[PDB]
């Protein structure tokens, strides 16, 4: 069966016909125990000195509002001028949502500009089971890319969900599960998150947040010794 032909005939995207969507649940439980309380800060990131965000992060998840998500938007001009390398830990990771257009190229420049190399290309494949173009596009675009970068010395690289309703820009929460299952460290930063993305074990910073609770000293206190090097997947260290 040729699913490309079928999509041309019926409008059903080939990904509509992918099936299947011990236990890694103890791991999810250990992640849940070591998670810091959610912390969040409203900040207009264009006008913001990100150096105030401390300590340096083990994971950064970067979700700038691209113009192409809407059919304040950030261009790739704005994005690559962010000083991400000033808040990343010497060994750390980035997950950068790049869209489906020029972001697949300009996002790689960003990663390299900030000192990372790409190790994974995670593809969010959007099904249209419920509802069966950029001028330069050759094909209908049915996916977004989240690039994974590393600096310093169980899951697949695909997320499959139904295409969200027009105007809805949320990315699949599955991206958080992939990141947390990597056990990369406990300082996790989500840039351009929203009230609806705030989540235990994460510091969320974005312009549309309606409330803040971030305090750099309080935040750093979660990783003072004996907890400085936890992966986020191990039992807590006992006190008194």
């Amino acid at each position: 069966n040729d699913y490309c032909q079928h999509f041309v005939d019926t409008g059903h995207r080939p990904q509509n016909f992918i099936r299947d969507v011990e236990l890694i649940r103890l791991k999810d439980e250990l992640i849940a125990k070591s998670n810091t309380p959610p912390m969040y800060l409203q900040a207009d990131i264009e006008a913001f000195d990100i150096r105030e965000l401390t300590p340096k992060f083990d994971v950064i998840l970067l979700e700038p509002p691209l113009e192409e998500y809407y059919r304040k938007c950030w261009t790739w001009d704005d994005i690559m001028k962010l000083e991400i390398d000033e808040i990343a830990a010497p060994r750390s990771f980035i997950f950068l949502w790049c869209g489906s257009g020029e972001g697949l190229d300009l996002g790689r420049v960003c990663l390299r500009k900030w000192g990372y190399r790409r190790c994974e290309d995670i593809c969010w494949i959007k099904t249209n089971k419920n509802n069966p173009l950029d001028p330069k596009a050759v094909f209908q675009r049915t996916k977004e890319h989240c690039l994974m970068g590393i600096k310093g010395t169980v899951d697949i690289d695909l997320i499959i969900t139904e295409e969200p309703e027009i105007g809805n820009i949320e990315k699949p929460v599955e991206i958080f599960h992939i990141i947390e299952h990597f056990c990369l460290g406990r300082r996790r930063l989500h840039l351009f998150g929203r009230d609806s993305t705030i989540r235990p074990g994460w510091l969320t910073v974005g312009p549309t947040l309606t409330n803040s609770n971030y305090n750099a000293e309080t935040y750093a206190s979660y990783f003072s010794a004996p907890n400085s090097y936890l992966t986020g997947c191990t039992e807590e260290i006992e006190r008194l």
Binding site: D20, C119, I156, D157
Partner: protein, 202 residues
């Protein structure tokens, strides 16, 4: 001349100027990713030096990439004069439509580059995701040829580093695991005889 055509050769040394101009170029190059490799590979410089630019005036390049060739392929694509305008993902399934360093890989990528200004192509007919079953090793799916034919029907196309299973109507396949030289287009046959009177690339 519509039927399949092919040239067994070393694509490094073949004078591709004898082949004319193509609406579509596709390649699945033997990128030198750091491994032993069951086949022979091309260094980054040999990939860069390939004479892709002479093959098209206006049209599309399809370039399979993996590993660090996702970045190198973009370099080659831009050095050869193309702009990357799309990226096809092949989701690899088994016969039951289930998907087969840090993450396990369920997919392979195909960069789509444009050069010049192609006109009369049917852009937007297909979508950028392929769902299709794995065949032999490093065997890309047949669905790509129907996508390419709907995009540019009846035009001349050329594949680089193809294997015998890759030969198709409207395509000229080059590769070093093909069997000999099968040419039918009279223009191509004439220029080949001129460039290679004794039938050998060196």
């Amino acid at each position: 001349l519509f039927p399949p055509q092919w040239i067994c050769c070393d694509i490094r040394y073949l004078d591709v100027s004898i082949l004319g101009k193509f609406a579509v170029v596709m390649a699945d190059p033997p990128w030198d990713i750091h491994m032993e490799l069951p086949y022979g590979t091309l260094t980054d410089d040999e990939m860069r030096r390939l004479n892709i630019p002479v093959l098209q005036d206006d049209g599309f390049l399809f370039l399979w990439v993996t590993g660090r060739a996702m970045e190198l392929g973009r370099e080659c694509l831009n050095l050869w004069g193309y702009e990357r305008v799309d990226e096809i993902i092949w989701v690899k399934t088994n016969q039951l439509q289930r998907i087969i360093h840090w993450l396990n890989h369920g997919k392979e990528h195909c960069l789509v580059g444009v050069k010049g200004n192609p006109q009369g192509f049917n852009q937007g007919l297909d979508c950028d995701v392929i769902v299709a079953e794995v065949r032999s090793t490093s065997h890309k799916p047949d669905e790509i040829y129907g996508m390419i034919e709907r995009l540019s029907p009846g035009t001349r196309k050329i594949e680089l580093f193809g294997r015998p299973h890759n030969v198709q109507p409207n395509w000229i396949t080059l590769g070093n695991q093909l069997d000999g030289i099968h040419l039918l287009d009279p223009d191509v046959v004439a220029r080949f005889k001129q460039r290679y009177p004794d039938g050998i690339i060196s």
